[PDB]
């Protein structure tokens, strides 16, 4: 019809006396009439992501990323749903990208890595850690 130029942030008109939410954004009435009405982003991480992953709400969206230890197979950094997840635990021994210390031998897990020690590990740091040394 026409455009109101009163809408309020995040919101656009509908016609030259009404708007409505952008998408990803929500308000108390389906239509807003007044430029006092809000249009606040909606958290859709707390309404899924898939496997080794996690949801982190932005402004208008979100975004389905891969957790910290594992990289998306398809190489997609960000994704929408379970369907687009190709996360898989990132093997840091084989890629050589474990920080291990020439005393020890890098053991991957599943989310992580460690590093083990013939040598026994200088005092104050464990062995089976990621600065294990050992002598
Ligand atoms: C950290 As998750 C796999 O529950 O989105
Ligand atoms: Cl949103
Ligand atoms: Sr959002
Ligand atoms: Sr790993």
């Known amino acids: 019809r026409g455009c109101a130029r009163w809408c309020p ?11 409505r939410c952008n998408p990803g954004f929500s308000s108390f009435s ?18 899924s992501c898939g ?18 230890g594992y990289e998306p ?6 994704f929408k749903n379970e369907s687009e997840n190709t996360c898989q635990d990132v093997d840091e021994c084989s890629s050589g990208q474990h920080q291990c210390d020439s005393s020890t031998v890098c053991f ?21 850690q990621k600065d294990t040394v050992c002598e």
């Open 9 to 19: 942030q995040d919101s656009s008109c509908v016609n030259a006396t009404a708007c």
């Open 30 to 47: 389906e239509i807003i009439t007044t430029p006092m009405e809000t249009c606040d982003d909606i958290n859709e991480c707390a309404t």
């Open 51 to 68: 496997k080794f992953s996690d949801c982190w709400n932005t402004e208008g969206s979100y975004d389905c990323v891969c957790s910290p």
């Open 73 to 78: 197979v398809s190489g997609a950094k960000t």
């Open 108 to 128: 991957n897990t599943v989310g992580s890595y460690s590093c083990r020690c013939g040598w026994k590990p200088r005092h104050g740091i464990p062995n089976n």
